[PDB]
Amino acid sequence: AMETQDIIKRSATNSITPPSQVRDYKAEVAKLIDVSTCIGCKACQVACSEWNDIRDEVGHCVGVYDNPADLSAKSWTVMRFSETEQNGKLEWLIRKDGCMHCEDPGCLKACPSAGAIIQYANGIVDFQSENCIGCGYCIAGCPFNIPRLNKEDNRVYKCTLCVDRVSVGQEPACVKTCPTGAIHFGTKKEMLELAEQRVAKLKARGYEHAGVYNPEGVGGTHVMYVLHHADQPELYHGLPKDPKIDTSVSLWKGALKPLAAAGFIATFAGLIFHYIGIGPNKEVDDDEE
Amino acid sequence: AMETQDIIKRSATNSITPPSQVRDYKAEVAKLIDVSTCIGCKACQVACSEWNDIRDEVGHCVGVYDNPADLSAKSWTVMRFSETEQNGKLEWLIRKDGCMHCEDPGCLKACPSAGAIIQYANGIVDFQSENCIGCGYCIAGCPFNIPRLNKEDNRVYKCTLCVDRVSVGQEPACVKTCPTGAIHFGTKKEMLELAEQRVAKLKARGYEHAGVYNPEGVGGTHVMYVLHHADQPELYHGLPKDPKIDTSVSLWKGALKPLAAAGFIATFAGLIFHYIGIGPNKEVDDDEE
Amino acid sequence: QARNYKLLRAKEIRNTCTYCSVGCGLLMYSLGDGAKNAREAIYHIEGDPDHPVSRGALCPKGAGLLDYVNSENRLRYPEYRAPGSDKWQRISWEEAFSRIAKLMKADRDANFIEKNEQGVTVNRWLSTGMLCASGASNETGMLTQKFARSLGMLAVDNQARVXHGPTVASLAPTFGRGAMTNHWVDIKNANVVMVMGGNAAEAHPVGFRWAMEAKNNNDATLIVVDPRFTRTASVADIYAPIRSGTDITFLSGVLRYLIENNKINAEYVKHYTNASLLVRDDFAFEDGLFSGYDAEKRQYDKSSWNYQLDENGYAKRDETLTHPRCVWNLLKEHVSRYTPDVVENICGTPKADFLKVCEVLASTSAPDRTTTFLYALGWTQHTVGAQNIRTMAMIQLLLGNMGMAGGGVNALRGHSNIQGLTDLGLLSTSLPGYLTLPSEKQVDLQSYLEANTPKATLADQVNYWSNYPKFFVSLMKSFYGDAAQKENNWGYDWLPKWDQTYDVIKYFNMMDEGKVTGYFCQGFNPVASFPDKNKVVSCLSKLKYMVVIDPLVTETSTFWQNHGESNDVDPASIQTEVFRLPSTCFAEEDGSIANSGRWLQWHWKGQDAPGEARNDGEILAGIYHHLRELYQSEGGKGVEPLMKMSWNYKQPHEPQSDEVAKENNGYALEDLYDANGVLIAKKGQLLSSFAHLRDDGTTASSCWIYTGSWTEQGNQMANRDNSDPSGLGNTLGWAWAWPLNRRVLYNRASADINGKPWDPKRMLIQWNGSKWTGNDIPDFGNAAPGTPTGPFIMQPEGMGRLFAINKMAEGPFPEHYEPIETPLGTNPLHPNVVSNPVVRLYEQDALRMGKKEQFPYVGTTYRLTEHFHTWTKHALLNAIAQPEQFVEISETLAAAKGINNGDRVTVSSKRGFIRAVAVVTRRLKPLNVNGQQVETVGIPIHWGFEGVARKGYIANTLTPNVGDANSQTPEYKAFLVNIEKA
Amino acid sequence: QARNYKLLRAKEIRNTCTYCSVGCGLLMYSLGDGAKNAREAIYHIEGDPDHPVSRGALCPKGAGLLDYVNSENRLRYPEY
Numbered sequence A, B: 001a002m003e004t005q006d007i008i009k010r011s012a013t014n015s016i017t018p019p020s021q022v023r024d025y026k027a028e029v030a031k032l033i034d035v036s037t038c039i040g041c042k043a044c045q046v047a048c049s050e051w052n053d054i055r056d057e058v059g060h061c062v063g064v065y066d067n068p069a070d071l072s073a074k075s076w077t078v079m080r081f082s083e084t085e086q087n088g089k090l091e092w093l094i095r096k097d098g099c100m101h102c103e104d105p106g107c108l109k110a111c112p113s114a115g116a117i118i119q120y121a122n123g124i125v126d127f128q129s130e131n132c133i134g135c136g137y138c139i140a141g142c143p144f145n146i147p148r149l150n151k152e153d154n155r156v157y158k159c160t161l162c163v164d165r166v167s168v169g170q171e172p173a174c175v176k177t178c179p180t181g182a183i184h185f186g187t188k189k190e191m192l193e194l195a196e197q198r199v200a201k202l203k204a205r206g207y208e209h210a211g212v213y214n215p216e217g218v219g220g221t222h223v224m225y226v227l228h229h230a231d232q233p234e235l236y237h238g239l240p241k242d243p244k245i246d247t248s249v250s251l252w253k254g255a256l257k258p259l260a261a262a263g264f265i266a267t268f269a270g271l272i273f274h275y276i277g278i279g280p281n282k283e284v285d286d287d288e289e
Numbered sequence C: 001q002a003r004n005y006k007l008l009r010a011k012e013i014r015n016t017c018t019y020c021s022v023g024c025g026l027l028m029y030s031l032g033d034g035a036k037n038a039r040e041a042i043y044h045i046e047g048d049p050d051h052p053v054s055r056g057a058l059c060p061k062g063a064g065l066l067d068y069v070n071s072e073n074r075l076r077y078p079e080y081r082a083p084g085s086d087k088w089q090r091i092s093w094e095e096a097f098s099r100i101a102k103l104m105k106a107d108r109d110a111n112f113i114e115k116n117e118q119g120v121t122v123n124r125w126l127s128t129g130m131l132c133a134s135g136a137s138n139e140t141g142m143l144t145q146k147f148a149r150s151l152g153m154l155a156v157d158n159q160a161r162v163x164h165g166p167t168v169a170s171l172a173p174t175f176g177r178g179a180m181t182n183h184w185v186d187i188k189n190a191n192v193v194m195v196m197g198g199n200a201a202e203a204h205p206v207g208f209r210w211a212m213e214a215k216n217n218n219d220a221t222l223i224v225v226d227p228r229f230t231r232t233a234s235v236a237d238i239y240a241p242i243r244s245g246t247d248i249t250f251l252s253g254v255l256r257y258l259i260e261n262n263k264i265n266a267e268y269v270k271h272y273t274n275a276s277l278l279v280r281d282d283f284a285f286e287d288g289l290f291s292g293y294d295a296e297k298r299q300y301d302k303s304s305w306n307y308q309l310d311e312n313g314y315a316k317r318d319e320t321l322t323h324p325r326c327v328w329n330l331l332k333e334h335v336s337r338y339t340p341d342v343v344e345n346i347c348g349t350p351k352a353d354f355l356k357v358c359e360v361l362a363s364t365s366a367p368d369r370t371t372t373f374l375y376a377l378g379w380t381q382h383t384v385g386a387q388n389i390r391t392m393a394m395i396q397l398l399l400g401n402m403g404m405a406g407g408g409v410n411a412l413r414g415h416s417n418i419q420g421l422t423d424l425g426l427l428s429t430s431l432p433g434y435l436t437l438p439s440e441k442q443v444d445l446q447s448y449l450e451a452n453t454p455k456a457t458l459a460d461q462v463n464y465w466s467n468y469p470k471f472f473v474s475l476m477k478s479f480y481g482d483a484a485q486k487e488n489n490w491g492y493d494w495l496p497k498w499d500q501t502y503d504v505i506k507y508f509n510m511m512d513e514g515k516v517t518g519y520f521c522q523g524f525n526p527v528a529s530f531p532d533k534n535k536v537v538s539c540l541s542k543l544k545y546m547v548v549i550d551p552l553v554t555e556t557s558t559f560w561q562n563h564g565e566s567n568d569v570d571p572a573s574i575q576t577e578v579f580r581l582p583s584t585c586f587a588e589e590d591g592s593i594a595n596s597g598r599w600l601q602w603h604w605k606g607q608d609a610p611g612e613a614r615n616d617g618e619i620l621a622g623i624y625h626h627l628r629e630l631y632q633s634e635g636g637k638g639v640e641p642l643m644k645m646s647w648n649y650k651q652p653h654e655p656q657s658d659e660v661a662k663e664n665n666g667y668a669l670e671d672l673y674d675a676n677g678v679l680i681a682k683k684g685q686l687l688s689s690f691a692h693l694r695d696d697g698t699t700a701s702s703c704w705i706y707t708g709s710w711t712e713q714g715n716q717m718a719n720r721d722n723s724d725p726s727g728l729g730n731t732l733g734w735a736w737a738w739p740l741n742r743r744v745l746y747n748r749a750s751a752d753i754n755g756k757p758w759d760p761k762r763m764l765i766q767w768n769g770s771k772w773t774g775n776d777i778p779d780f781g782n783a784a785p786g787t788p789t790g791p792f793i794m795q796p797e798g799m800g801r802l803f804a805i806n807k808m809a810e811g812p813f814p815e816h817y818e819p820i821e822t823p824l825g826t827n828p829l830h831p832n833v834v835s836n837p838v839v840r841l842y843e844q845d846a847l848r849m850g851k852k853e854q855f856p857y858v859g860t861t862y863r864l865t866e867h868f869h870t871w872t873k874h875a876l877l878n879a880i881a882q883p884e885q886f887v888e889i890s891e892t893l894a895a896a897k898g899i900n901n902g903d904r905v906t907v908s909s910k911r912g913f914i915r916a917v918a919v920v921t922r923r924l925k926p927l928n929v930n931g932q933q934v935e936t937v938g939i940p941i942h943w944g945f946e947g948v949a950r951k952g953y954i955a956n957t958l959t960p961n962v963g964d965a966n967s968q969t970p971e972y973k974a975f976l977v978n979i980e981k982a
Numbered sequence D: 001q002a003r004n005y006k007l008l009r010a011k012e013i014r015n016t017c018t019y020c021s022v023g024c025g026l027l028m029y030s031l032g033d034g035a036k037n038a039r040e041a042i043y044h045i046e047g048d049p050d051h052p053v054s055r056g057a058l059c060p061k062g063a064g065l066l067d068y069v070n071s072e073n074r075l076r077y078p079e080y
C-alpha cells in the first residue's frame, strides 16, 4: 500500500500518523456531467461495466426505463430518470448517478478499518479491498448513498473514477464513451470553467436557476453536475440539496472517541489508585491489629 | 494484495471471508501443449528463464538429453524425454513439464499461510512470495510434483503462466517462442476446440487413443496436453493417469480441522463447567463444615 | 496502488461499429501480439478518438460490442434440422455444401425459366429466393450479387425493402439521388434541427452529438415532432405531438404557411426548382384523386402528370411564375386545403404548437439560415411513406436549404451497411450503381439502353445518366470479362429479366401458395422483422429447404421449434430441411461498409471466428463451387448464364476483400487516352474516376459510383486524415465518400446564380474564373455562373422537383391518406378516398385487417437506444440495460383499463397478441382528432425467443401485412390494437 | 498483483538472429530511450511476430541471444 506516495486521507488512521503523501503536487481532476445535454442512452453504464470487468444480473422491468434500478456491487453507475411538470411543462430529467468523489468523504470518515478507504492527491476516493471488513459503516456515512456490498466477498465497491486509467494519463471509460458530450473530464479548475460557461448558455435560454452542483457541505466534489434547475436538485431523482456529513456520524466518529478514551484512562487510574489507597475489603481488617 | 479484485481462491482463508473477487467476468485462458508436434528443442526452457530473470546451475550429463533433470526454483519448465517400444515400434515421446494451473489446486488447498497461494479469475494459480513461510506443504499437496523451494530465500516458485505478460494482453514467453507451434495459447474454450481438432487428425493418422489431457480430478487444467497415447499418460515420463488431490491431504485439510475445533471447544466447556460444578479438590472439603 | 492498465501489451486493431449507420470508429484489443502460436481473442473494445464523426464516443450498443463478439449464442458449427425433427444435428462443412448444392440444383433444374410466353430469353429462377446481409461488408455484398444473379434469382432483397425503400423512391425523383444529402458532422452548422419521422437521440446517438453541437454551440433550435415524448424530446427546445400516419397533413400545412407568408428563398425557388415549368392542361386533382385513375386496376395512367413541351421538345417555362399551369401556381392550389384547423383536426397537433414549428421553420427561408431534417422510419414505414418524404423535400426546396452546409435532407440510414447493399443493388430488380436489370419487354441491348438512358428535358443540363451505357458495359466486363464482347452484346442475355418486382410481401404471398421451394437468410431475421409474424411462420413452414448464414442463433433459424406462446408450433408438422451455417462477425474480417453519409470505411480483422465459423464469402464460395461442379458434370437448365459469371480470385474458395473492393473500383482493360491523345490510364491499372469508364469494352467496374475508392494511389477507404481546414467539419481526408469524394450533395446550390454563397460564412464551392473549387468537391461540372445549367446534375431538367411528374405511384404532389387500419375509419379531408388509392393489398391480408370497433387504439412500433433489433439481446451488457419487454401507454388509457404502472398487459391486433410490462407515462397522451380522443399504444421491437434478455414476444406478431404503394415497405408505424389487463 | 511488465518503456529495435540461416526476426529491448546521456544496454530479446518465416518463434539459440550479447567472455580490448 502507499506505493504512490500521494495518499492525502486514509480511513481509520490516527491524525498524528498521516499516510505517505510527499508526492502531492498534482492537479485535482474532475468529471462534469451536464444533465442538460444527457440523452439517457446508458452508454456510460455499459462502458463502465465493460471496462471494469463486472456484470450485474439481468433484472426486470417494473414500469420505468431505469435499469438496473439501483447502484450495486456489479453496477457502479446508473442512469436515474424523472418525469415532472413542476416547472410548468413536461420535462424528462435524466441524471447519471454514482460516487461523487467528495473532497471530505463521509465513507472514509465512518470506516473503522485502517486503509480500507483512501483519498489520492488528485481527488479520487478509492476502496482498498484487502482491508475491507464488510461492516457497511461507509453506506451510512456517505451523504449520497453510494457504497454497495458484494454478497460474494463481503466487501463494498463503487465508481473508482477509473483510477486505473487516470493514474496513467487516460480519461475514464464513461467520459470517453458519452455520445453527446454530456460527460466532460479534465482538471477540476477547467471543469469549473466549462461548468460556468454552460450555466451562462442555459440562463440565456431561459433557465434562470441553472447552476453547478459542487456541494460545499462535503468540501466540493470531483464529480460535478450542470443542472437546469439547480434550485431544485431533488427533481433529479432525489439528488440532495445541500448535502453534508450527518451530525450523528460526525459526533460518533469525532468527539465520542477521545471522550471515551478519557473516561477509560480516568476510570483505570481511579480504580487503581483507589485499591492502593484504601486496600482490600476482606472479612476482617480489624483482627489485623 | 487484492489490487486486481478478481481473486477467486486464496490459501488458508476461511470460507466465510472470501477474497476480493468482484471483477470476475473474464474469460479463462489456457496453454495447449501438443506433444505430437514437439521437437524437444528446449526453446521454452530458454525463453522462460530469459523472460523471468532466472538462471539455474550448469549441471551434468548423466546419460540422457533431459537437462536440467528436474524442475527447480531456477527452472520453471523442463522438457522430459522418453524412449519406448511399448506401442510396437521405437517412439521418442517428449513432453514439456511444469505447473498445470489446476482449476482446483492442491498446492493452494494444502498451504497453511494466508495469501501465499492465489487463483485469479482467468485460471492462473500464482505464489504471492511475501506470505510464503517455506513449509513445503504445497509440494505434497500438488498432484503433479511441481512446487520447488529456493534455498536462498526459503520460498517456493513455479511457472506463473507468465502472469506479468497475460495480465496486460500478451501470451506467455514459451508459447510465443515454440518453433513448431506445439505450444498454443488463447481462451480455454478455443484451446479445447483446437485440441479436439488435433485429436481428430491424429486419429486419422492411426492413433486410435489420441486424446486431450485436461484432468477432471483436479477440475480441469489451464495447461493442457494433446497426447498421441492418451490411454497411457505414464509413457510421457510419468504423467499421472487420472490425477486428483490425495485422500490423506483432503482429510487433513478438510474434516480434521472442524472436528479438532469441536473437540477443543467442547473440552474447554467441559473442564470449565466441571470445575465450577464440583469445585476444587483440596486436602479437606470435610472440615469446611 | 490501482490495478495495472489491462491493455498495455494487447494488440490494437481499428474497426467500425457493426450496428447503425453513424459508422463510429472502434479500437479493439486482443490478447496475443499476433505471433502464430497465440490465438488472438478480443477482450475489450472502446472508441477511436481520432474518428471525426464519433471522436471516441460509443452508445450502449457500440460500447457493448465485446458481449456480442463473445456472446454465448455465437454459432460454432454447421447444423442441420431434418424434416419433422425437434433438434439440430452437427454436420461438416463439406456435407452442408454438398446437401445444399444438390437441393438447389434439383429445384433450379425443375423450375428455371429460360424463355417467357412471348418468346424472349429471360433466364430467371423464381422458386428459390434470398435475403442479404446489410450488417455484412460491401465485398460480401458483391459476392452475394454475383452468386444470386448468375443463378437467375429475382427474389433477392436486403433490409432496404422494409426500411429506406420509400426514401430512394421519393428523394431520387425530387433531387436526383436517393441518399442522405449531407453528413453527420455537418449537422453542427444548422440553425434549426428538425427531428420528425425519426428519434435520433435513440436511433443514431453518436451522430446526434452534432445536433447537440448545433443547439448548444451554434444557438440552433431543436424541434421534435412525434406521437411520443422521446429521449430526443427530452433535450428539444420545442416538442409537438402528432398522430401516427398523418405527417403529410402536418407537412402540407407547413408548405401552405410558407407560401401564404412568402417565407421562401425566392431566387432559389425560381432558378433551382421546377416552379416555372408548365404542366399539361389535362393534369387535375379532385376529391382525393389525381387525373388518370383506373379504379379497377387501382393504378393511375400518368400521361397527364407531365410538362407541356415546346417546339424543341423541352419543357415549356414561364419565368414570371404567373401562368396558371406553372408548377408554382398548381402547388399553391394543391396545398391551400391544409389550414391550421385541418392540421389540428387530422394530426391532433394543437394549433399553438403547429404555429411555433411553422414560425421557426419559416425563419430559415433567409439565405443565411438553414434547417436540416433528421428522419428515418417514422416517415418511411407507411402506405404513404414515399409521399411523407416528398413533402419534407419540397419544404427544403422552398426554404433554399438543399446544397448548404447545415441544411439538406439527412435521411438517417439504419444498418451499418444498408447504404452499401443498396449501392450494390441487392434489391429485386437492381444491379450495382443504381443500374436496373432488363425487364422482359426489353428484348435487346439497344432497347434496354434506350429505356434506361434519359433524354434531357431542358437544354444545357449535365443530365449525367446519359452515361448509362458506359456504366452498364463496364459492369458486364466486370462480371463476364473476355466472355462479354460487342458480338454477343456484352452478355446481355445472361442476366435474369423481370416480369415484375419480387418484393418480400409478394414473395411470401407466393410462398404461402406453395410456389417457393427454398430460401436463404443471410444476416436477416424475418421471423422477427417481417410484418405479421404468425403468417410469416406459417409461410416459412411450407418451404422445402432454408439456409441461414449468421454469427448468432436467430428466431428464423429456430422457427420450427416450440417456444410456448412466443412460438407455438409443432415441429413434427414442419417438413422444412434447415441448414444453419456459422459465419464471422464484423470483428473477424477486413472489408468496407458505407455509412449514412456515403463514406466507404475500411476495417481490419481482430481475431478469427469461434469454432468452425467461416467468412461469408467462403460460405458462398463453398456452395457455389459445389453447385457449379454439379452443372459441369451433369449439365442442367440455365447452364450458360451460371458458368459464364467470373470468380477470378487468387484462391477461389476464399475471395479476399481487397480483390473484390478493387473490382468495385474498376480497371482499365486497355491503355486509355483522352481526346487530346494524352494517356489517362494504362492497361491493368485501377481507374481513378467513373469519368474514365467507357461503353466499348475497354473498362470494367462492378459499381461505378465507387470508382475512386481504391485507385493507383491506394485504398482511399483506409485514409485517416481528420483535417477540417474550413471549420465546417468537412474532412475530405477521412475514408472516401461516393460519388468522387463529394461530402455534401447538390453543393452548387450553396451559391446563387452568380456564384455567390447564400451565406458567406458557409462557402462550400466558388468559381475561380475557370473551375469550381472550395471546401468540398463540387457536385457539378464546369458550367460558369449565369449559364442555364441546374445544380441537380442527375435530373434531366437540372432542378429540384416540387411537382414529381410521372415518377411517384400515387401522385406528383403528396396527399393525405389514412393508414389501412385507422382509428377514425374515415379520412376527414375526403371521405370518399380513405387510404392510398394505389395501395396493393392481397385478399388474404385484407381478411387479416382489423377495425376500430374491435381494436380502437393506434399501435406503433419503434426502437429503444439500448438494443439493436433482436440482435443485442444476445449480448449480456445490453440485456442488463433493458432486460424485459414492455409497452408504453398514457395515464388516461391506463386509468380507463385499471392498469397500474408496471402491471402486465396483453396487447392484441386482428393478427395476434403479445404480453408485456406496462410503462404508464405522461410521455404518451391522447390527442383530439376529428371529434374523438385517439390513444396510442407503443411497442418497442427488441424482445423475442432467443437471447440472454428475458424471453418475450416478437412485436411483429401485431403488425399488418401491407406497405408503401411505391416500394412495398410495410406500414409498421401506424396500425390498430386493443389492450387488456394480464 | 503481478510484477509490472518490464519492457514498457524500453527502446525496441528490429534485428535478425545471428546463428543459423532460417533468418528469424527479433525484437530487442534496451534500457535507455536513445537519449545521448543514457548508454543503451540490451536486457531482453524475443521474436518478431510479423516476420513471415518465424512469426514470433525462436529456438533455444535465438531465445538465448541475451546471454551471448552479454556473455562474460565478450572481448573488450585489443590484446597481444
Ligand SMILES: Nc1nc2c(c(=O)[nH]1)N[C@H]1C(S)=C(S)[C@@H](COP(=O)(O)OP(=O)(O)OC[C@H]3O[C@@H](n4cnc5c(=O)[nH]c(N)nc54)[C@H](O)[C@@H]3O)O[C@H]1N2
Binding pocket: C020, C021, C163, C196, C197, C198, C199, C200, C202, C203, C204, C225, C226, C227, C228, C230, C242, C243, C244, C245, C246, C247, C375, C376, C377, C378, C379, C413, C414, C415, C860, C861, C862, C863, C864, C865, C866, C867, C868, C869, C973, C974
Ligand atoms: N437504438 C437503436 N438504434 C437503431 C436501430 C435499433 O434497432 N436500435 N435500428 C437502426 C435501423 S435498422 C433504423 S432504419 C433506424 C430508424 O431509426 P428511427 O426511424 O428514428 O427509429 P424508430 O424508433 O423506429 O422510429 C422513430 C420514431 O417514430 C415515431 N413515430 C411513430 N409513428 C410515427 C408517425 O407516423 N409519424 C411520426 N412523425 N413519427 C412516428 C416513434 O414514436 C419513434 O419515436 O434506427 C437504426 N438505429
Ligand SMILES: Nc1nc2c(c(=O)[nH]1)N[C@H]1C(S)=C(S)[C@@H](COP(=O)(O)OP(=O)(O)OC[C@H]3O[C@@H](n4cnc5c(=O)[nH]c(N)nc54)[C@H](O)[C@@H]3O)O[C@H]1N2
Binding pocket: C018, C133, C135, C136, C137, C159, C162, C163, C164, C377, C381, C414, C415, C522, C523, C524, C525, C526, C528, C529, C530, C549, C550, C551, C552, C554, C583, C584, C585, C586, C616, C861, C862, C863, C868, C869, C870, C871, C941, C955, C956, C959, C972
Ligand atoms: N415492427 C417493426 N418491424 C421492423 C421495423 C420497425 O420499426 N417496426 N424496422 C424494420 C427495419 S427498418 C429493419 S432494417 C429490420 C431488421 O431486421 P433484421 O435485419 O432481420 O434484424 P437483425 O436483428 O438486425 O438481424 C441481423 C442479422 O445479421 C447478423 N449479421 C451480423 N453481422 C453479420 C455478418 O457479418 N454476416 C452475416 N451473414 N450475418 C451477420 C446478425 O447476427 C443478425 O442475426 O427490421 C424491420 N422490421
Ligand code: SF4
Binding pocket: A033, A037, A038, A039, A040, A041, A042, A043, A044, A045, A079, A096, A177, A178, A179, A180, A181, A182, A183
Ligand atoms: S453516456 Fe452520456 S448521454 Fe448517455 S446516459 Fe450517460 S451521461 Fe447521458
Ligand code: SF4
Binding pocket: A011, A107, A110, A111, A112, A113, A116, A117, A127, A131, A132, A133, A134, A135, A136, A137, A138, A139, A147, A155, A156
Ligand atoms: S464496509 Fe469496508 S470500506 Fe465500508 S466502512 Fe466497512 S471496512 Fe470500511
Ligand code: SF4
Binding pocket: A098, A099, A100, A101, A102, A105, A106, A107, A108, A125, A141, A142, A143, A144, A145, A146, A147, A158
Ligand atoms: S459520494 Fe459517498 S462513497 Fe463517494 S466519496 Fe463521497 S462519501 Fe464516499
Ligand code: SF4
Binding pocket: A047, A048, A049, A051, A052, A076, A077, A098, A158, A159, A160, A161, A162, A163, A172, A173, A174, A175
Ligand atoms: S469514472 Fe469509471 S468507474 Fe466511474 S462510472 Fe465512469 S467508467 Fe465507471
Ligand code: SF4
Binding pocket: B033, B037, B038, B039, B040, B041, B042, B043, B044, B045, B079, B096, B177, B178, B179, B180, B181, B182, B183
Ligand atoms: S519450445 Fe515447443 S517444440 Fe521446443 S521443446 Fe518446448 S514445447 Fe517442444
Ligand code: SF4
Binding pocket: B011, B107, B110, B111, B112, B113, B116, B117, B127, B131, B132, B133, B134, B135, B136, B137, B138, B139, B147, B155, B156
Ligand atoms: S511453502 Fe509457501 S506456498 Fe508452499 S505451502 Fe508453505 S507457505 Fe504455502
Ligand code: SF4
Binding pocket: B098, B099, B100, B101, B102, B105, B106, B107, B108, B125, B141, B142, B143, B144, B145, B146, B147, B158
Ligand atoms: S500443478 Fe501443482 S503447483 Fe500447479 S496449480 Fe496444480 S497443484 Fe498447484
Ligand code: SF4
Binding pocket: B047, B048, B049, B051, B052, B076, B077, B098, B158, B159, B160, B161, B162, B163, B172, B173, B174, B175
Ligand atoms: S507460461 Fe511463462 S512462466 Fe510458464 S513455462 Fe511458460 S515462460 Fe515459463
Ligand code: SF4
Binding pocket: C017, C018, C019, C020, C021, C022, C023, C024, C054, C057, C058, C059, C060, C061, C062, C063, C204, C205, C206, C207
Ligand atoms: S450503434 Fe451507431 S451510434 Fe451506436 S456506437 Fe454503433 S455506430 Fe455509433
Ligand code: SF4
Binding pocket: D017, D018, D019, D020, D021, D022, D023, D024, D054, D057, D058, D059, D060, D061, D062, D063
Ligand atoms: S532462432 Fe534458431 S532457427 Fe531461428 S535463425 Fe536463430 S538459430 Fe536459426
Ligand SMILES: [Mo+6]
Binding pocket: C159, C162, C163, C164, C413, C414, C415, C418
Ligand atoms: Mo433499417
